[PDB]
């Protein structure tokens, strides 16, 4: 259930752990790019939102 | 902890934090004290000698 881009949806992720374990390395994706944290370190961090 | 990685000596703090603050900062912008994610004690971080 993906949204039309004009009305893109959004879900909140909270009160949970992990799955930042470079999931993109499954190579099911055409592209994966981070604009903040380098991808390999995402799974070492804590987030508030 | 949740980040705020560093080395120091953790002792009980006499500080109170507002419920949403988690940690504080000194004038040097270094962490002064943190709240322990588990049990929520506030610990002062002093330098190692």
């Amino acid at each position: 259930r993906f949204a039309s881009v004009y009305a893109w949806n959004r879900k909140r992720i909270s009160n949970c752990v992990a799955d930042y374990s470079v999931l993109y390395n499954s190579a099911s994706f055409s592209t994966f790019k981070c604009y903040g944290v380098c991808p390999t370190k995402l799974n070492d961090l804590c987030f508030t939102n | 902890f949740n980040g705020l990685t560093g080395t120091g000596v953790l002792t009980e703090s006499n500080k109170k934090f507002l419920p949403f603050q988690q940690f504080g900062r000194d004038i040097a912008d270094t962490t002064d004290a943190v709240r322990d994610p588990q049990t929520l004690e506030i610990l002062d971080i002093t330098p190692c000698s």
């Binding site: 903040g36 944290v37 380098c38 390999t40 370190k41 070492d44 961090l45 | 980040g3 705020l4 990685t5 560093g6 004038i27 040097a28 912008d29 270094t30």
Partner: protein, 49 residues
Amino acid sequence: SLSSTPSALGKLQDVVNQNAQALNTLVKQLSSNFGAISSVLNDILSRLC
């Protein structure tokens, strides 16, 4: 006269104040980014490769 007037020893107090200001300015430059993503080295290292 010396007891009564607080400005009587201003020449020595001024030296003390200038030196205190220099140190209290130097420690505050640690909070500066200088164009970096963060003023803190530990944040740079925990998030960037």
